[PDB]
């Protein structure tokens, strides 16, 4: 099932000297030494990594022509007494095998080839999962979205809601990579997760991904109780105490350990390949949601009690909160006249206005990009 | 665009009129400096983060200095805008108070400690409104659709 943790390894190796060689190097070449697969694993090492030596590469290409050569005579064998289920499965030799080649033609032009001569929807969304899931490995967003609108074609009897949840996990795992943190948590949250022994779910990851994707967009009063007093996730983060003490350090206001808990997440931001403005934006919105949670209950916030939030003192809160009100996303202001921060709340009536100036402009601009002669 | 090559009131409407005709035109000269120069002038009026950095990967046309000065104003201090200016020095387009203007949009609170610190009729503060304040922006899109009629006069 291309491609597994080798996606994360392919990230971690090409990640800079934050992480290079030395024992992410062997587990990568445990697959490269395994699966005998030339057409990506030379394009893998091309990226500032490794060159010829050809030492693995010869019997790698040789077993590639062994399996690739022997699969062809089932495509030419499946006419004696072998129907379209067997030309089908011969194209599954070419399809699973030429999908773990990791080529975007060897898999991609085989799947539309097996989209012809095709039995019903034990296939039509079996492959469009299996095409979507390697599209995650190659992050080609057009392939993902076209597999969504090809994958909303489940009206079989398709009200197969242990296969909607496979697609719902795929939507959550993709929409966390395209900033849509609203769609990610609930989809994840209301899923439970199970996909052929959770092999793409790769759990020891999933419920964690939920409980540190939630507090971006899942609203702090509403379903955060459904996070906390929801008896489906609390017992499986019981074995995961780090994200647990990341979770109950917001609603319990013990923030001298919460910034500690968020500094952990900024060290396990390194792992996931949906990476860079996701963790910088993520720490930004954990940070801003943490400060806005504190000062909203008070009409006046003193310097000593805001210093009590960790123990950072003054200038951390001063420069940082001045950057936040420079962004204007809280309502506070660094009233150093007394060193007591004031907070009323102008509501979200203005939120819209400010939102829609930019929004409106962008929308018209798109049309302004089109509605000239170029049509 | 050549008319775009002082005033800042209409450099962005001539930027919309400018950034039209280049499917694949040149690699030096005509195609290159129109985009990056005009968005630099779009920071000479003072327009900051959210059209800048994700709009960069379309061109990527040698892409060092002008973007560096855009975040050098997006932060807004003279200390590292110095080394944007003097250490580069060849960036050209020679033709300071604007990155001063960014940080003092905040204030400490408002007055700033009896009219004195440094950082380095609608009783509301300017949120929104239901009168003259938001009306101006409103009649923006209406005007746009009216100007977009031109579409009906083309077949």
């Amino acid at each position: 099932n291309p491609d597994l943790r080798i996606a994360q390894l392919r990230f971690l190796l090409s990640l800079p000297e934050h992480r290079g060689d030395a024992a992410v190097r062997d587990e990568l070449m445990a697959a490269v030494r395994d699966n005998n697969m030339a057409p990506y694993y030379e394009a893998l090492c091309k990226s500032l990594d490794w060159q010829i030596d050809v030492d693995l590469l010869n019997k790698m290409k040789k077993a590639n022509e062994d399996e690739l050569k022997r699969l062809d005579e089932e495509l030419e064998d499946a006419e004696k007494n072998l129907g379209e289920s067997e030309i089908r499965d011969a194209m599954m030799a070419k399809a699973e095998y030429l999908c773990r080649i990791g080529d975007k033609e060897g898999a991609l032009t085989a799947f539309r080839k097996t989209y012809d001569k095709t039995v019903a929807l034990g296939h039509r969304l079996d492959i469009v999962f299996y095409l979507l899931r390697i599209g995650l490995f190659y992050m080609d967003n057009d392939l993902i979205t076209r597999n969504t609108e090809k994958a909303k074609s489940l009206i079989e009897e398709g009200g197969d809601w242990d296969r909607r949840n496979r697609l719902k996990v795929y939507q959550g795992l993709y929409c966390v990579a395209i900033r849509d943190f609203k769609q990610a948590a609930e989809l994840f949250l209301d899923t439970v997760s199970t996909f052929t022994s959770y092999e793409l779910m790769d759990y020891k990851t999933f419920v964690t991904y939920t409980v540190y994707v939630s507090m971006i967009a899942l609203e702090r009063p509403d379903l955060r109780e459904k996070v906390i007093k929801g008896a489906e996730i609390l017992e499986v983060l019981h074995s995961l105490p780090a994200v647990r003490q990341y979770l109950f350090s917001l609603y319990e206001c013990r923030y001298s350990v919460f910034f500690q808990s968020l500094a952990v997440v900024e060290q396990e931001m390194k792992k996931d390949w949906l990476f860079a403005p996701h963790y910088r934006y993520y720490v930004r919105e954990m940070r801003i949601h943490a400060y806005s949670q504190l000062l909203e209950s008070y009409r006046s916030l003193t310097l000593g009690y805001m210093a009590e939030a960790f123990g950072v003192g003054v200038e951390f809160i001063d420069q940082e909160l001045s950057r936040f009100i420079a962004a204007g996303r809280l309502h506070c202001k660094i009233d150093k006249v007394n060193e007591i921060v004031e907070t009323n709340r102008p509501d979200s009536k203005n939120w819209q206005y400010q939102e829609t100036i930019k929004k409106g402009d962008l929308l018209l601009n798109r049309v302004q990009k089109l509605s000239r002669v170029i049509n | 665009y050549y008319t775009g090559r002082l005033e800042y009131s209409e450099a962005r409407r001539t930027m919309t009129n400018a950034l039209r005709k280049a499917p694949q035109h040149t690699a030096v000269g005509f195609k290159q400096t129109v985009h990056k120069l005009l968005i630099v002038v779009e920071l000479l009026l003072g327009e900051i983060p959210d059209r800048l950095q994700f709009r960069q990967p379309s061109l990527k046309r040698s892409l060092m200095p002008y973007f560096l000065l855009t975040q050098a104003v997006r932060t807004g201090n003279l200390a590292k805008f110095n080394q944007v200016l003097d250490q580069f020095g060849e960036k050209f387009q020679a033709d300071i108070i604007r990155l001063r203007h960014n940080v003092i949009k905040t204030g400490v609170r408002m007055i700033s400690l009896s009219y004195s610190r440094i950082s380095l009729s609608k009783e509301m503060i300017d949120i929104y409104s239901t009168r003259e304040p938001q009306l101006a922006f409103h009649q923006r899109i209406s005007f746009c659709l009216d100007i977009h009629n031109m579409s009906v006069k083309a077949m």
């Binding site: 910088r280 | 997006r74 932060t75």
Partner: peptide, 26 residues
């Protein structure tokens, strides 16, 4: 991505600012 981030200027993040924060206090 494709929702405009800052990612500009700022020195090493809440891990290191956490580190010199608690170290500078203590």
């Amino acid at each position: 991505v494709w929702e405009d981030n800052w990612d500009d200027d700022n020195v090493e993040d809440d891990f290191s600012n956490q580190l010199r924060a608690e170290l500078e206090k203590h």
